[PDB]
């Protein structure tokens, strides 16, 4: 349901030169460490939570 809450951001590359990646937190709340490792892998620096 959060993609409803952020749908204008996803539609925003249709009008701007903005590149975005989209990732989902796991079902376990404590399993964020592979997600932060994947943040480390791709070297992204601008995260919207």
């Amino acid at each position: 349901t959060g993609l409803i809450r952020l749908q204008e951001l996803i539609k925003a590359p249709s009008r701007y030169n903005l590149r975005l990646k989209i990732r989902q937190l796991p079902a376990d709340t404590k399993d964020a460490k592979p997600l932060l490792k994947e943040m480390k892998r791709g070297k992204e620096f601008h995260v919207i939570f």
Partner: protein, 48 residues
């Protein structure tokens, strides 16, 4: 008989649905896209 979204912590377990689940269908769509060697694709939807 129709797809609906489910709340991730809905504890009701007395329902089944024969609609094909869109995780597997989206995996099929992504595999079909990966077969066609595409790079730029535009996803057009109707309702949110």
């Amino acid at each position: 008989t129709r797809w609906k979204h489910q709340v991730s912590d809905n504890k009701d377990s007395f329902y089944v649905s024969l609609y094909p689940d869109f995780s597997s269908l989206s995996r099929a769509i992504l595999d079909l896209v990966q077969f066609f060697k595409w790079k730029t694709v535009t996803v057009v939807y109707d309702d949110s």
